[PDB]
Amino acid sequence: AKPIDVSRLDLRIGCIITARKHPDADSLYVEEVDVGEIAPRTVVSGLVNHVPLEQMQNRMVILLCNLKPAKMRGVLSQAMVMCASSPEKIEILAPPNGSVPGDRITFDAFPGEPDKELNPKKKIWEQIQPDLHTNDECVATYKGVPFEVKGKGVCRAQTMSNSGIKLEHHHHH
């Protein structure tokens, strides 16, 4: 059986092309994200109170691309934006300069291919998530190993140090 480490996740850099308030939701954003594929992916983000819409535009992000696509009040989200989060504040993790859509986040320390699709019932993300935190310098890591785009740099939060990393739970215990 494949190991239960960050190698099971499919993380890629993306660029938010379009962002708008969700038509039928008051706390969600609807973005079209270029992840380097033929067409953009639709992403529904609950960041209304944390990131103004104007700052969501043309925003480079790190996306978890192998989660089961799910309906969000009618809109099927095809990926989720990775953020440093706490009951305090929420910050979108920023890729290093030069990163372009489609760039992959990898870890030599953890060999393995991501799962085509993460089966929620197997809660693979639920077991990995606790090892996902930003370090003392705000750099995103997995068990202390930095989220890196080979040849470009590491991903980091703006001000959130020693923080947990989530892409949904953002508002509840």
User: Site residues (CB under 5 A) for Hg ion?
Assistant: 15, 58, 60, 137-138
Q: Based on CB atoms, which residue is closest to Hg ion, 140 or 167?
A: 140
Nearer to Hg ion, 111 or 144 (CB): 144
Please state the closest distance from residue 104 (CB atom) to Hg ion, in A: 17
Alpha carbon distance, N-terminus to C-terminus of the chain: 32
- Decide whether 58 or 86 has the Cβ nearer to Hg ion: 58
Q: CA 103, CA 70: separation in Å to the nearest integer?
A: 24
Shortest distance (Å) from residue 138 CB to Hg ion: 3
- And the tokens for 2? 């494949």
Burial label for 88, CB within 10 Å (0-12, 13-18, 19+), is: exposed
Could you give phi then psi for residue 152, rounded to 5 degrees?
-125, -40
Calculate Rg over the CA atoms of the chain: 15
- Of the pair 5, 91, the CB lying nearest Hg ion is at 91
Shortest distance (Å) from residue 82 CB to Hg ion? 16
CB of 63 to Hg ion, least distance (A): 13
